Structure formats: C-alpha cells, structure tokens
Short mmCIF file of C-alpha atoms in Angstrom, two decimals:
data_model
loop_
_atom_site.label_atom_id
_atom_site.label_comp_id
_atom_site.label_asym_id
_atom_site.label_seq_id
_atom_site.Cartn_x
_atom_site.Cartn_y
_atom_site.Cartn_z
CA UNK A 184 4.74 8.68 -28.74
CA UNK A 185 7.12 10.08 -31.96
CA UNK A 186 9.28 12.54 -29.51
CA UNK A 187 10.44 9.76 -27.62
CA UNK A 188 12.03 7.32 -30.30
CA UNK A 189 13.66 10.86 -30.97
CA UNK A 190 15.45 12.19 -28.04
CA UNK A 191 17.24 8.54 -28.22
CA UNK A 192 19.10 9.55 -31.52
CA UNK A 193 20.80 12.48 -30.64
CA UNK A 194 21.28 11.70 -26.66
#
C-alpha cells in the first residue's frame, strides 16, 4: 500500500 504514496513524490 507504502509503494504507491511513493511513486507520487518523485513522478
């Protein structure tokens, strides 16, 4: 569920 909130950041 983690990776997600991620990839938002840096995109």
């Amino acid at each position: 569920h983690k990776l997600l909130h991620q990839l938002l950041q840096d995109s």
